Design a protein around this ligand. Structure first.
Ligand SMILES: Cc1cc2nc3c(=O)[nH]c(=O)nc-3n(C[C@H](O)[C@H](O)[C@H](O)COP(=O)(O)OP(=O)(O)OC[C@H]3O[C@@H](n4cnc5c(N)ncnc54)[C@H](O)[C@@H]3O)c2cc1C
Ligand code: FES
Ligand code: FES
Lengths: 1264, 49, 99, 49
């Protein structure tokens, strides 16, 4: 039984020959060429790979719909299932479907990539539940992440579907659900004609789909090493990433006996195959229909399943799977174990029945099963009268911890008949209490039981400091604090210890309906991004002879390289050749201060650095070849950590510094002196489109054309031309769009393009390659972390008088941009304060870590954070209010910065004043200490922060750009200009401008792509100035055209614009023109401390409330108001969109994102599973943004200020509001401690918060 | 005429906003553009020859 | 190009006007978004008309460069370009002609 | 021209042409053609949009 048959979007597919290893995405994407169902992690939790399975049920003869991620689902599972895709529901060449149009028109799709994913998530919801609750929609989205938008517009656009302004929701089209596409009538004709088992054969694996229970059991009995697959959410990971290969799989799953639910006398009983998603559904209602004491265990299982994971996954993974899979960190197994659950195991002639207990997991991912035994069913038990249960998980194969807890009393009293405490994440496997449990048996639920328990909890499950996972006294404390939580919430259930919005400014009254500058018009291409149709990169079709690449990389941190062995790789089917450093025919020494190598020669310098690449016919073959070439190294010593670096004296050129005053004077002249150090963590770009490069060689005279996901067009061109050894003018690079860049694609992009280029040059035919999430996070590398030490002198009014601060920056294993970053750091130590004697330095440290590069911010957001620390340490040492202190030493209109540039037209105090207004700080402040007084165990915090950001490139000669405008004989215009779209509306702003200058409707002008023979020699699409510089150029070119036309307008001044063009054409005038621009009077010198480094400044101010839970280390993000100066916005919908996005990225950088590295230097942390970026769930509860009104900026295109980066720092407020509530919990449980000065580091995670909230328990744990 | 290369046309449609790009053996670049844009019913500036 | 050396003649001219070797200038293809609104490649005048245009464009470039040639009149042509780049001049230009 | 590679999904065309010197055109019969292996569709005057 061989042919598999399924349907896609309505049409049938009959695939004669399936290989069990080809994943649904991939069939979709590259066999029936329907793009736009995107790949984002491949690992399960980014959901950009989301689609919808509809199939006919058979057991409840019903037709069911669900979501699922297609990056994970093998096609052999899909027999006789039907797939709906993004391009199934709607399209711009017909009707968009309302889920499509609303997410577009409400501003919810900037860069555009995560968009189809969210659309289907939503689409499916509606098809199950055709009028949902704002909570249910809330919540489809655990499965889906977006980077560019900060979420708000998404939910506010869809809020609409359920029960001076920005978009009209009353004009949206309405939605008639009788009009979705029909369940194919052709399955359904099947459905009678009954199943028999099927076998498919692959290139390496064999898949048997079983159909009765009898055939399962026999199969397994004669081939016991055969691997069961059901949900594939496990095996899928194992086979892809920990290169394992099980050659014979049988998948049960069809089998009625393994999918049944049953209402026993005693508990409910569920078939091993059933998905989580239906275990939930069952419980959810059978809890609400039932005497609230039988339901005590149920409430716990459901308690874990909200924070498990998210819908695309719950609808595929089985309880069966989770139970036997068996990881250290299952959240289900503790509960089932503590529950004493009830498993039904079988083989042929075997009918075992075990109660779950400490005994069931002996060792590392092992159970009691024999090889020929399969799990039949689990049974979760009703709770007896006076039996009590909770479950705990806490968050951000080892660390966190998760627990199930159970107690039973001798009836009609307190006493303790039974007790069991089971903990995930503290060992090898899921463990039990038990020594501690024993001794507590028949006491009383009272104080000295609470003590004896916590005492034993620290001894028994004590941790060595080497234990893997790290983190030790967090991991510790949690064990008690969960218990303590538990102790309390028992008591409560007897006799119970009682005491007793976004706004902006309207355009001029006067101005035209079709002048659009200043009006909030949505992103030129959101429809098409929402629809599937916009083409990103690997989205561009193959050619018929195109190869794949995939590149080989150093598994040690510093070593010589003894030799390379290619033999195991030439055995793979379709293998073409291995490219290495000996093959470049050009010059292997590239990079951008010439520090680095295109391919390593003789020695490897970090964790790894490209050694070479392999070239094959498919990308799965590409993988297996990679795998294949095996290298042999002799191992030299490693610098890693910031220190080392210094303890060794490393690093990268001579100590940078700025000075003003004298300073010897301050400090002698001063009341108090503090004196501290703090560390800021690094960070990951995580754009959704990861890097890549289709390179196509023409073959006459060295020509080659490259399609490339970059911010830097120029450079991708030259370093390709250098490496190849040919004239720049044979190379052409084009960029139509990107899934985001945030700096991460200003330089590093070249590392890939370069390799790809050569494979084409060598083999003479097109080659492409694009990174998987795991390769990309290794290779390209991060934002720079910093160590700073400081000293600051100040009066007892709070007026500051002298300050001294040292910075270092860890760089990595090539210089790159790292210098320019440090400089920008220095320009920003003042934040917004005048400060008349001041000394700031910094160093650049050489390490065997991959090279760090440019990231939104450019070092600025590192402190302004340093100072601002330091600052609230002043205000606390004085005795306060923190407001009064900052207000007190603000720059004021017309002062000068520590680099002697004048502060002209300075808005900052208007942002200040006007923020504390609306936000209403006081009274809110008062309302907070009050909650702090009345709550013992949860606390709250409040903060208000400022910011100023210099705008302009620091190398002055980068501040230029340039454009090219064609007018066709039919009236239509063709615009292109230097800079590139990363989903931030450059193009839509570039249109807006040119529409105005030329005085013809936005509708009539089109821009198509960006390229290096339309306009050469272009600056990186970079430091927020990208708008302003092309802004200018577009203008000029516009003007040269209108001069050309005057004569013909004059002679007929009431005719059409088409009229004036046919006109000039026949008279013989040019209709094509160039246009250029330079920012004038720029240039600061370092040794002279004079002259002018920026062009103007962005300003703004933020205010945040938070509340922590100082039992666990988790917090809510209660409210946040911003007020931002943008000048006279070009487009207030897209700015703002800009504001909120950046603000959320700060969220991530100060509180959520952490990278880890093995002691000897290999990055440990490589996907959405271990690197947690902020989710729909994580944005502030109320989120208020406002642009500042009446304040034109005369130094930049039609009055507007730059908007990219400045606002990202403002998240700062959430960090300090977080430092504040910490105060309040320290002062409750520390007995006293006057005016504390305590070390807090960025990023403030659950570990670090908990750790610093000192009390009873922290003290019991005291003495990778 | 009897040239050796006889006439022809690779036409490649991109699919967003009517764009199409055409590789064409011609002496007259302009016109190949407009009469394609006329027949299709779209702005000249979506066509490239 | 229909195989009649338009391109080779267009190079020859621009090599001369700019006074840099034929070897250093490349032409790759002809297209309707590099230069729009073009007459048929037709009645023998195809040489002369583009001939002219190429010239003009050539001239606008050499005017842009003068200053940097002046300040170093015995340096390389590469010398004068890195030069003007860092000082901030356009290196891309159009060019037209009518009989 | 046709020297430029295929893409991996590229179709071929080839166009149908009048076998008389002046006449009206009474109707077109497409049936014998949909039997050929790999046939995709017949384009005619009713399709230009
Ligand atoms: C995005 C994502 C998020 C996740 N979040 C969580 C989380 O929050 N908490 C958590 O605990 N886990 C989490 N997981 C794991 C997921 O819950 C498990 O993969 C799921 O429990 C497995 O069911 P399955 O159908 O995929 O098993 P499969 O992946 O098909 O294979 C699983 C195991 O079951 C086996 N098996 C053996 N006997 C049987 C039998 N009797 N019946 C059925 N299968 C059998 C197979 O050998 C295999 O090892 C997450 C996974 C993903 C990738
Ligand atoms: S789940 Fe497929 S890329 Fe994230
Ligand atoms: S719009 Fe969602 S990642 Fe860019």
């Amino acid at each position: 039984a061989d042919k598999l048959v399924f349907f896609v979007n309505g049409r049938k597919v009959v695939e004669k020959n399936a290989d069990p290893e080809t994943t649904l995405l991939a069939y979709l994407r590259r066999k029936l060429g329907l793009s736009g169902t995107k790949l984002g992690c491949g690992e399960g939790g980014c959901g950009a790979c989301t689609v919808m399975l509809s199939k006919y049920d058979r057991l409840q003869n019903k037709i069911v719909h669900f979501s699922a991620n297609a990056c994970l689902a093998p096609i052999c599972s899909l027999h006789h299932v039907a797939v709906t895709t993004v391009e199934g529901i709607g399209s711009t060449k017909t009707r968009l479907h309302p889920v499509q149009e609303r997410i577009a028109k409400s501003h919810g799709s900037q860069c555009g990539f995560c968009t189809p994913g969210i659309v289907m998530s939503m689409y499916t919801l509606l098809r199950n539940q055709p009028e949902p609750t704002m909570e249910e929609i809330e919540n489809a989205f655990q499965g889906n992440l977006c980077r560019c938008t900060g979420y708000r517009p998404i939910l506010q656009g869809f809020r609409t579907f359920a029960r001076p302004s920005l978009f009209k929701p009353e004009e949206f089209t309405p939605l008639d659900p009788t009009q979705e596409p029909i369940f194919p009538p052709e399955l359904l004709r099947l459905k009678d004609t009954p199943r028999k088992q099927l076998r498919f054969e692959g290139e390496r694996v064999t898949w048997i789909q079983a159909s009765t229970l009898k055939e399962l059991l026999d199969l397994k009995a004669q081939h016991p090493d055969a691997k069961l697959v059901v949900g594939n959410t496990e095996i899928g990971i194992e086979m892809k990433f920990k290169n394992m290969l099980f050659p014979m799989i049988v998948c049960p799953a069809w089998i009625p006996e393994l999918n049944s639910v049953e209402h026993g006398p005693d508990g409910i009983s569920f078939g091993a195959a059933c998905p989580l998603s239906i275990v939930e559904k069952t419980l959810v209602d059978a809890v609400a229909k039932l005497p609230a004491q039988k339901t005590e265990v149920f409430r716990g299982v459901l308690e874990q399943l909200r924070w498990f994971a998210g819908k695309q996954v719950k609808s595929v993974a089985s309880v069966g799977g989770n139970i036997i899979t068996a990881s250290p960190i299952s959240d289900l197994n503790p509960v089932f174990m503590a529950s004493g659950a009830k498993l039904t195991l079988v083989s042929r002639g075997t009918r075992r029945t075990v109660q779950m207990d400490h005994t069931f997991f002996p060792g590392y991912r092992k159970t009691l099963l024999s090889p020929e035994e399969i799990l039949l069913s689990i049974e979760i038990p009703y709770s007896r009268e006076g039996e009590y249960f909770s479950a705990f998980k806490q968050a951000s194969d080892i660390a966190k911890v998760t627990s199930g807890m159970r107690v039973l009393f001798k009836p009609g009293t307190t006493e303790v008949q039974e007790l069991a405490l089971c903990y995930g994440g503290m060992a090898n496997r899921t463990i039990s209490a038990l020594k501690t449990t024993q001794r507590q048996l028949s006491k009383l639920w009272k104080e000295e039981l609470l003590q004896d328990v916590c005492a034993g909890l620290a001894e028994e499950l004590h941790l060595p400091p080497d234990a893997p996972g790290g983190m030790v006294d967090f991991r510790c404390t949690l064990t008690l604090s969960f218990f303590f939580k538990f102790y309390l919430t028992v008591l409560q259930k007897l006799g119970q210890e009682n005491l007793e919005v976004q706004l902006f400014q309207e355009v001029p009254k006067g101005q035209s309906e079709e002048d659009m500058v200043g009006r909030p018009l949505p992103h030129l291409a959101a429809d098409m991004q929402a629809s599937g149709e916009a083409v990103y990169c690997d989205d561009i079709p193959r050619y018929e002879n195109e190869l794949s690449l995939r590149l080989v990389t150093s598994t040690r941190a510093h070593a010589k390289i003894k030799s390379i062995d290619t033999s195991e790789a030439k055995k793979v089917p379709g293998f073409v050749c291995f490219i290495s450093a000996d093959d470049v025919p050009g010059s292997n020494i590239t990079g951008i201060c010439n520090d680095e190598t295109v391919f390593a020669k003789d020695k490897v310098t970090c964790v790894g650095h490209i050694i070479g690449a392999v070239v094959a016919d498919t990308p799965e073959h590409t993988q297996r070849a990679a795998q294949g070439v095996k290298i042999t190294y002799e191992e030299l010593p490693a610098i890693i950590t910031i220190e080392d670096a210094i303890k060794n004296n490393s690093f990268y050129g001579p100590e940078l510094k700025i000075e003003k005053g004298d300073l010897k004077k301050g400090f002698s002249e001063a009341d108090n002196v503090v004196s501290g150090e703090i560390y800021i963590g690094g960070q990951e770009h995580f754009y959704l489109e990861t890097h890549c490069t289709i390179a196509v060689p023409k073959g006459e005279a060295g020509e080659m054309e490259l399609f490339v996901s970059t911010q830097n067009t120029m450079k991708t061109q030259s370093f390709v031309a250098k490496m190849l050894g040919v004239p720049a003018n044979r190379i052409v690079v084009r960029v139509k769009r990107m899934g985001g860049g945030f700096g991460g694609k200003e330089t590093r992009s070249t590392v890939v393009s370069t390799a790809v280029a050569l494979a084409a040059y060598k083999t003479g035919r097109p080659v492409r390659c694009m990174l998987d999430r795991d390769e990309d996070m290794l290779i390209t590398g991060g934002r720079h972390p910093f160590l700073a030490r400081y000293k600051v002198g100040f009066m007892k009014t709070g007026t500051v008088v002298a300050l001294e601060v040292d910075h270092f920056s860890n760089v990595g294993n090539t210089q790159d941009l790292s210098q320019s970053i440090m400089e920008r750091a220095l320009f920003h130590m003042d934040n917004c304060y005048k400060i008349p004697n001041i000394r700031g330095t910094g160093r650049l440290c050489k390490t065997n870590l991959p090279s760090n590069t440019a990231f939104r911010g450019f070092g600025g957001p590192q402190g302004m954070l340093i100072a601002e620390c330091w600052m609230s340490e002043v205000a606390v040492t004085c005795g306060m209010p923190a407001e009064e202190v900052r207000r007190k030493n603000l720059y004021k209109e017309g002062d000068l910065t520590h680099f002697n540039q004048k502060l002209e037209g300075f808005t900052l105090p208007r942002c200040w004043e006007e923020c504390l207004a609306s936000s209403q700080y006081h009274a809110r402040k008062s309302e907070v200490d009050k909650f702090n007084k009345e709550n013992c165990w949860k606390k709250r915090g409040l903060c208000i922060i400022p910011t100023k950001f210099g705008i302009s490139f620091t190398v002055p000669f980068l501040n230029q750009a340039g454009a090219l405008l064609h007018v066709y004989t039919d009236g239509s215009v063709l615009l292109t200009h230097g800079g590139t779209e990363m989903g931030q509306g450059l193009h839509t702003k570039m249109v807006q401008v040119a529409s105005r200058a030329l005085k013809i409707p936005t509708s009539k002008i089109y821009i198509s792509e960006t390229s290096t023979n339309t306009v050469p020699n272009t600056s990186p699409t970079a430091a927020s100035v990208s708008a302003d510089l092309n802004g200018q150029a577009v203008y000029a070119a516009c003007q040269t055209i209108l001069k050309r036309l005057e004569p013909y307008k004059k002679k007929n001044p009431s005719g059409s614009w088409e009229d004036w063009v046919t006109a000039a054409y026949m008279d013989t005038v040019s209709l094509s023109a160039t246009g250029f621009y330079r920012t004038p009077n720029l240039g600061y010198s370092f040794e002279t401390n004079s002259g002018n480094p920026f062009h103007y400044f962005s300003y703004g101010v933020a205010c945040s409330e938070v509340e922590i839970d100082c039992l666990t280390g988790d917090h809510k993000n209660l409210r946040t108001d911003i007020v931002m100066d943008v000048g006279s916005s070009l487009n207030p919908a897209i700015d703002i969109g800009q504001v909120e996005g950046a603000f959320v990225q700060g969220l991530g950088l100060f509180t959520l994102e952490e990278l880890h590295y093995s002691p000897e230097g290999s990055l440990h942390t490589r996907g959405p599973s271990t690197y947690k970026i902020p989710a729909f769930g994580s944005i502030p509860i109320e989120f208020r943004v406002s642009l500042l009104r009446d304040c034109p900026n005369k130094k930049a295109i039609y009055a507007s200020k730059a908007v990219g980066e400045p606002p990202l720092f403002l998240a700062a407020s959430i960090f300090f509001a977080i430092k504040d509530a910490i105060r309040a919990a320290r002062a409750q449980h520390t007995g006293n401690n006057v005016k504390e000065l305590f070390r807090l580091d960025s990023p403030a995670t659950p570990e670090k918060i908990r750790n610093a909230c000192v009390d009873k328990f922290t003290t019991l744990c005291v003495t990778w």
